[model samples]
Target: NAMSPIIAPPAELVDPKDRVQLRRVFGDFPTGVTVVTVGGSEPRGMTANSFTSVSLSPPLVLICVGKDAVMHQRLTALPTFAVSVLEAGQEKAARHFADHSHPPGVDQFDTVDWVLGEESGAPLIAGAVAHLECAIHRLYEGGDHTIFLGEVITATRWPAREGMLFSGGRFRRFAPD
Candidate 1:
């Protein structure tokens, strides 16, 4: 005889107020590293692991920037931005952008090799695995971070290199099974 199996719901719903544990639990899920860039006379960039594709029909993508981040103000004031998906060897680029101690109003790309995206005028890291130039479509407030929904205006990819990944508060590389 055949028997039916029982289905169970989530074991426990995480408390939103528990930020420490929430961050640790969220860190278990790996994410690709990206440098979200905004351009002007002086280009600005911030390292982010919160980049994600939202839709294909409209070619929408999203990235979360902390409200206090320097790039947050620049991005909101500008209409367009770029996301450069870092390659496995570009950990230094990620670390550089993530460092908050760097004085404000200083050029962050001085040591890094990058090119300006023609369409968006945003800086795109030269050796990145992929690049996306996008126009800001919408903005949503999410607690301490602001979510920017962008509509991709241009996209490019370099298939030869493996993209960088982050998990458990550390950078990681993919290993083939």
Candidate 2:
């Protein structure tokens, strides 16, 4: 009672107009980085930190994509997509996909090392901590972003790899306590 509250819901937090501050606040929370890949006439990828496991029963996961991102339109029409949980050394690959100049055609995957996922036929980055193939289960309107609900079709994880994390707008390696 003597100390300040660590958590509280503020009335003014709703519809706060400062996107820069909000993005900074969002970056303050640590999250694992992922490369979302999809296949078609060509392979494509996008770096995403806003990803999470939504459920266990029947297996579900979700990734958020900006409405204007190329991946958003691709996912809207594609039947499947894949998620690669980047490992500690995969920061370069993350940046490559996240780059605005990286064209979304056949050239993007040229510099990246990946193998086609068996179930989804999507690119799974070589040395990722995990790879998950999912079919679009549902979609939701999330303001400027679209929430992609995916039902996991296939999942593989490597226990020995250190998963990469993003916090304070920086890619961080997991340091042991």
Candidate 3:
């Protein structure tokens, strides 16, 4: 039987010291922009590019939220939330939700155009490339962020269109060269 090697914990790999370069390293990989939304006492949202599919079994997806974000609190408390995959033209909307000044408990639906999704009680943005409303299945703490594993309750996709991408702290439109 082959045995897995045990690796030593290097001094440079410890917390706090490793975080400064973490964002930069993660930024090297391009990610699609998304707005995570929660509806209830107060509709809340935050712009994130850390959304990804987890498992097809039972239809699952995951999005990471900073523990300190207002949207994190709202979504964690609620039974369901929504993820709107931004299209190529929604850079401004992405910036708006990403801003820290946007107060919580305010109806973002009023600020952003969206219609209630059929399966989940969450709102789906009007013209996103795609959208998914999910029910919270598991929550796991990861460093400064929380991994929310959601079982996709419902979803919709618009006609195939270019998506908004985030890389190196900038929003980009997909253009064929």
For each candidate in turn, the TM-score is 0.89, 0.90, 0.85
lDDT of 3: 0.81
The models' CA-based lDDT, in order, is: 0.89, 0.87, 0.81
Q: Looking at candidate 1, what is the lDDT of residue 120? A: 88
What residue runs in model 2 are displaced by over 4 Å at the alpha carbon? 1-15
Candidate 3 stretches with Cα past 4 Å from truth are 1-18
Q: Write the per-residue lDDT of candidate 3 for residues 20-119, one digit (tens) a residue.
A: 6776667779999998887776677788888999899889999988888887778867869899999999866787788665875465656678887666
Ranking by TM-score: 2, 1, 3
lDDT of 1 by residue, 1-177 (tens): 233334554455678689887887899899999999999877898999999899999899999989889888899788899999999999889998885645467787898899989988998999999999999999998889999999999999999988998999999888985
Clash count, candidate 3: 0
**Model 1 lDDT, residue 140, Cα:** 92
Number of the predicted model whose TM-score against the real structure is largest: 2
User: In candidate 2, residue 13 scores what lDDT?
Assistant: 57
Candidate 2 overall lDDT versus native: 0.87
User: Residue 13: error of model 2 in Å?
Assistant: 9.0
Which pairs clash in the backbone of model 2? none
Off by over 4 Å in 1: 1-15
